[PDB]
Amino acid sequence: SHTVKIYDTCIGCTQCVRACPTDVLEMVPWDGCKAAQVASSPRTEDCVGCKRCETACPTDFLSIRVYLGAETTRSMGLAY
Amino acid sequence: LSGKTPLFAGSTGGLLTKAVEEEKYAITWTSPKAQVFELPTGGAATMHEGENLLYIARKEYGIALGGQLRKFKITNYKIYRILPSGETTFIHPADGVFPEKVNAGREKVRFNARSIGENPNPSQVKFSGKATYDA
Amino acid sequence: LEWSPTVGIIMVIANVIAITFGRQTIKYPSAEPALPSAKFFGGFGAPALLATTAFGHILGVGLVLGLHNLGRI
Amino acid sequence: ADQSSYLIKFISTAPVAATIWLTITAGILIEFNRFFPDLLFHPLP
Amino acid sequence: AGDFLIPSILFLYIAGWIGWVGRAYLQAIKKDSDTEQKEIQLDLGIALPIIATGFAWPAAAVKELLSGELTAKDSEITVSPR
Amino acid sequence: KKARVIVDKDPVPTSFEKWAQPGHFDRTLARGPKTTTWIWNLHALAHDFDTHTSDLEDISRKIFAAHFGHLAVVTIWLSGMIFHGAKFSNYEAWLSDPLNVRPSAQVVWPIVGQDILNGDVGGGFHGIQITSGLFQVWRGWGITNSFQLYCTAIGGLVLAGLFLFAGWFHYHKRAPKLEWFQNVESMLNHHLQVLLGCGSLGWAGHLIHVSAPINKLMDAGVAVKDIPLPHEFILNKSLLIDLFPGFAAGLTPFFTLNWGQYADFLTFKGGLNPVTGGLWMTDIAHHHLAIAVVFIIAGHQYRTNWGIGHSIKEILENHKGPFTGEGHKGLYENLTTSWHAQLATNLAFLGSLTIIIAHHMYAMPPYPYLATDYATQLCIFTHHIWIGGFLIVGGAAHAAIFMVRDYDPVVNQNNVLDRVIRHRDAIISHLNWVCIFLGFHSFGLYIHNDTMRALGRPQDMFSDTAIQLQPVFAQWVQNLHTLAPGGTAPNALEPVSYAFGGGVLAVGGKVAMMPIALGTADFLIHHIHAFTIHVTVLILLKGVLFARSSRLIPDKANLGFRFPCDGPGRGGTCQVSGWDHVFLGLFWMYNSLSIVIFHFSWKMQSDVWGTVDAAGNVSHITGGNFAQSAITINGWLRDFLWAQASQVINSYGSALSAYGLMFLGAHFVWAFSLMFLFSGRGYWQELIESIVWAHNKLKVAPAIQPRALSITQGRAVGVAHYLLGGIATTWAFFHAHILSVG
Amino acid sequence: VGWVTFYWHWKHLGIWQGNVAQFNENSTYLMGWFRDYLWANSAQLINGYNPYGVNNLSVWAWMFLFGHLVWATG
């Protein structure tokens, strides 16, 4: 799988969760920002690695990173 | 699963041998009326008035399809993972609430309590199992 | 090909064949400027009338040139 | 003459000002080399 | 001297003219409230006195150098992580 | 609903206010630049009128005004060419001696040494020899002096200014509504009748009264000054009747159908004029008369305000069948609501037509003294083949833009478009198979020939003296064309072209046209052509069928037509967009058409063109070496590229030296493309970071921040320079060889 | 390294024949390199095999075309 990390510079604008085409991301409660929410990545086995989440992230030098790793059938996006 | 398969004449874009061997997916939704949508595999299909059930090769197909079911204001779409053992698991939404909304009972996964310029150097973590992003 | 009244009557016969087909199978033969009679014309517009006679001239010129090329007329 | 204000803003735009300025520069060099050609070097007294 | 020394002096004077006029224009427009719009649309009332003034770029450059106004400090301008 | 004129009066005020506002048309560009990406986006989005507005009526008004602007610039170009023929030309010296004066416009001003380009082009004149064939066109128009060219160029300037005023007028004063444009039946009737048929009929009138008498007096060889002005063929009818005795009967055999009286000037002679090597002007006049009558008749098919005729919708809906579902139901709404769909069809078929025009004009040379001018024959062929290839790739681009933007699944539901979408994997995998098959059995035969010839085994080659591959079907078709006069075409005297058969026609000692024999080398190169076209079709059709979705990226139409990728995931998804398929297909279009024009050049110089002996022996330019050297890659390297580029690299210090300069400059631009093609923008942005540091240090950093080109722009610049460099290389090579040997 | 070996080769190929004047007069512009080095010296190479026969330079001609093919497959 790939690895999707979240750092504490998150501001909880939910844009990475909306950008994700495979439901890797979700918003969890928090007290570290004004929006009172972080991103979290529980379904990283479904990460294709397309980095739409990083494109959607607005904080300067991203609060979400994808570290590409071992390739599986799901991460290669293969329908066969 | 319950639902009527949407009306179209078939395509070469549909399910291949991966469905019978390792993984198959399915999306169900209920529609107020019969209307034409676009299949993820290419082509026009008609959804039924009432519940539907369309099988798909990948999870991303159902998320693209449920993304264009937002444009018809259909927001009760569910996605199921189907293994060749007959084992059907319900994946999206997994909590019951769409992941854009915060629901309680959700725990942080893969959170790092630091900013990203505060990762260790790769030489500091060399010849061990850990990566620089791991905690 | 010198002009003779056989050429005239074959042009008139082609006009009659074309107005026959134009009465039998035109989808909209009654356009806005109608003929003053509309009983010897079968019920037409003036554009449907001169469409039928123009196609009769197509057929008649093709007929008389083909029959002159054979040797009949 | 408010349209002429817009015209002088159009002349001030980068491609138009560049083509006018470089046409003047190319004209200076071309009209110099019509009259004084073949200067491989500066001749000394 | 006419092979390379005379054209060297001539080029360096004209090139310093062009560069000094461009530096003076960019520094003059960074205070006028919308800088990026004035880079694609030239202020002729700012640029043309600068291109007239640019004949004395060596004296202006030496006075810019000795007063510490030619360069910015290394702590004032952005870098990347080492 | 009826076809009528409804017009908004004064939609848009004429003012210079928005000329001071760059990028006023986009709402995101109107905010002004922050980076230099803004500057490139201003040009990429300038004619993308779907991004300007969402309303189809204002889009259509913009398109209709921009067409008049384009017609203005094309008429300025054409009146400029006619003005150069009027003023800076040896046209009057060329009329007196068409076989020994080389056609020239474009005198070069004497500055830094460049007057060496004013060559001795004959006729007491110095200038650049032209290969565009304007001399032959004005010759076939019957123009005898410079003053008629001045009148034509002044009229072209008036007509260009009139188009430019019409474009101002129909966007600012009187602009048509949406339903004025959607009268496609009215527009087809008017184009087929007036723009094609009435135009071809008026041109037949000119050919009968002006072009054919003047060119007949030229072929008799009178003088350029003793041939009278062409209004003295209308006023003094005896000058026609001395030449063409069918005018003595007047217009009465036209209306009484005694059309055989007009057989003096409405012939069906078939072949070429033996004096000029061109087509017979009576054949050309008769052609335009027939074509005009057919077009006038054809433009009455479609229903307009008077009931009779056709609905194109009702025609398209009836052409269904058992294999294709609903058939063409819905294709009318595609072509009447999407300008990109129309531009796809017209661009594809206009490019296909220009390739047909290029194949027709070499083999049936229309213009007087065109066929003996081997430079013009090479250049107009290759020019129109390149215009064809570019327009075809454009049709593929706009088919894909239709599929991303304007495709509606509700309109296109179980019709032929919806059914080709739903089996796109079968189409593309069989085309993949076809392309691999054609590659192996076209190029691998050349590799076999290379290896057998290098291994000292020429008895094992695929050639005419070894294992043979004869083109039996094309030889059969050419036999049917040779035997057509008197047989299947009884009223033709000579065959349509001499390329099929009929014998050598010599004009001025040189071959105008002779039979083009087909053998194993011709078999091989036609399958090279089949291969390279099928691969180009694979790339473009794949980009059109997969523009909205594939197995890999389902929501591809949400990402747009033109986007770089969808990230390094799914293995890496670079260049999945339809734009990127147009990008990749431009190279294969280049590959295909370069081999087409090389085939043409070497087949004609080896087997057609050349000098005719007084006995009747044809001695070709490269001496018949196509049969044994065009079958290996070493032969095409040596005997074509190495041997014929002797004239572009030995060209310095002469009149053809600009061709050698263009040869090296084009190799430069070609190689310079590869920096953009082989790299990506992360490198270039990181280099710009250190250069921006050195500007921040000396207080010269611009507020419009420097950015490396976008991934799409880097690909676009790379393919634009690759095409520009390669085509300009072949241009300079062709020009410098064929202005020297032919 | 292509520039340095083209230079080495064309200069020495002038020396080895007794014609330094070809290099000294023709290497100041790029058509001299193109013509007098790429075009002029590849003549006997591409005649290593031809429609008339074969000599001992046919491996190098075949390799020459081979290298064009591998480079372009890149």
Ligand code: CLA
């Ligand atoms: C105001 C103009 C200006 C000035 C003073 C400088 C100054 C400098 N540039 Mg430069 N540069 C500029 C514009 C300018 N740049 C532009 C427009 C570009 C994009 C093409 C670059 C791209 C560039 C690169 C890629 C590099 C430099 C480098 C450098 C430095 C070394 C000198 C050199 O290599 O010049 C070379 C510069 C060029 C060849 C650019 C062409 C200059 C244009 C044609 C003139 C600009 C004049 C301006 C448009 C007129 C405005 C006047 C106003 C009245 C309207 C020096 C700090 C180098 C560096 O960092 O070394 C330490 C380096 O590697 N420059």
Ligand code: CLA
């Ligand atoms: C010389 C350079 C070169 C070559 C050989 C190829 C080769 C190929 N390209 Mg291509 N391509 C190139 C440059 C080249 N490309 C460039 C520069 C681009 C950039 C735009 C592309 C972009 C591109 C696209 C976008 C597409 C291709 C396609 C193809 C394939 C064509 C169909 C086919 O299988 O033909 C048959 C194969 C050949 C003719 C190759 C030579 C085979 C030799 C002669 C036979 C084998 C010899 C021997 C038996 C081997 C034994 C070795 C030994 C160890 C035993 C083929 C594999 C298309 C494709 O995949 O369609 C199926 C396709 O869609 N290419």
Ligand SMILES: CCCCCCCCCCCCCCCC(=O)OC[C@H](COP(=O)(O)OC[C@@H](O)CO)OC(=O)CCCCCCCCCCCCCCC
């Ligand atoms: C894009 C270019 C296509 C050419 C590719 C060539 C081989 C590809 C064939 C693949 C099979 C496709 C299945 C078809 C789809 C299918 O459903 O077939 C059925 C189809 C008829 O379908 P229907 O009967 O439903 O059609 C009724 C309506 O669709 C309206 O026609 O028949 C075909 O068109 C077969 C003929 C194609 C044969 C091509 C002939 C080319 C003629 C060339 C003329 C050139 C000039 C010659 C001068 C000598």
Ligand SMILES: CC1=C(C/C=C(\C)CCC[C@H](C)CCC[C@H](C)CCCC(C)C)C(=O)c2ccccc2C1=O
């Ligand atoms: C070289 C290269 C660059 C570098 C090129 C850049 C940054 C653009 C070229 C610089 C432009 C041409 C500078 C223009 C600056 C001014 C307009 C110059 C004005 C001068 C006046 C006299 C007009 C990329 O950005 C790139 C991006 C993606 C893939 C490949 C590549 C690539 O190969």
Ligand code: SF4
């Ligand atoms: S890389 Fe793609 S699949 Fe993975 S979390 Fe980001 S957007 Fe989602």
Ligand code: SF4
């Ligand atoms: S990682 Fe970015 S998009 Fe995601 S919640 Fe944080 S700030 Fe928002």
Ligand code: SF4
């Ligand atoms: S290499 Fe470039 S185009 Fe390819 S996936 Fe990465 S960013 Fe996209």
